[PDB]
Every structure is written in C-alpha cells, then in structure tokens.
Design a protein around this ligand. Structure first.
Ligand SMILES: C[C@H](CCC(=O)N(CCCNC(=O)[C@H](O)[C@@H](O)[C@H](O)[C@H](O)CO)CCCNC(=O)[C@H](O)[C@@H](O)[C@H](O)[C@H](O)CO)[C@H]1CC[C@H]2[C@@H]3CC[C@@H]4C[C@H](O)CC[C@]4(C)[C@H]3C[C@H](O)[C@]12C
Ligand SMILES: [Br-]
Length: 56
C-alpha cells in the first residue's frame, strides 16, 4: 500500500498542516531522490513522510 498522486498530496496536506511540503528536500548551500521514490514507488511510514514537510 503506497501513496501516489492525489492520495499523496492529501496525506501531505494533512500531516504537514499549514507548514507546506516539498517533493524533494532542498540541499542548501555548502552541503556535503524524493517523496515519489520513497512513498509512491515504494511504501514509506509516517515518520519518513513527515520529513517532507517544510519548516515552521
Ligand atoms: C487519509 C489521511 C489524510 C487526510 C484525508 O484523507 N482526508 C481529510 C480528513 C479530515 N479532513 C478535514 O478535517 C478537512 O478540513 C475536510 O473534512 C473538509 O470537509 C474539506 O477540507 C472542505 O474542502 C480526506 C476526507 C475525504 N473527504 C470526504 O469524504 C468529503 O469531503 C466528506 O467529509 C464531505 O465533506 C461531508 O460528508 C459533507 O457533510 C492520510 C494522512 C497520513 C496517511 C498515512 C501515512 C502513513 C502510511 C502510508 C502508507 O503508504 C499507507 C498507510 C498510512 C497509515 C497512510 C494512510 C492514510 O493515507 C493517511 C492516514
Ligand atoms: Br519540491
């Protein structure tokens, strides 16, 4: 059981609330896949899903 398309967006809107979400985690400067790969093509748990919520 995975989350794809609208189901995936519904889950993110519910879990992230008003924070917003991204499909790929930004890399940021001086740093040393995405949610579709982790949660739609593959099954992911709530903890991993919430990691795609933007910051407060
Ligand atoms: C279904 C959950 C999201 C929310 C959701 O999915 N809905 C909204 C629920 C409550 N919503 C609100 O509080 C809103 O304000 C609405 O009620 C409000 O009415 C509208 O915003 C107005 O635009 C879906 C609700 C479906 N909607 C309806 O049925 C109708 O809108 C209905 O209620 C009529 O409005 C009403 O009859 C009129 O009188 C998502 C969030 C996280 C997800 C789990 C993540 C971890 C695991 C991943 C696996 O790969 C699969 C397993 C899983 C356990 C996932 C399961 C599931 O995928 C979850 C529980
Ligand atoms: Br993104």
């Amino acid at each position: 059981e995975t989350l794809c398309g609208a189901e995936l967006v519904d889950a993110l809107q519910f879990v992230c609330g008003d924070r917003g979400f991204y499909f790929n985690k930004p890399t940021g400067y001086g740093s040393s896949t995405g949610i579709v790969d982790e949660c739609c093509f593959r099954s992911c748990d709530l903890r991993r899903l919430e990691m795609y919520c933007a910051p407060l």
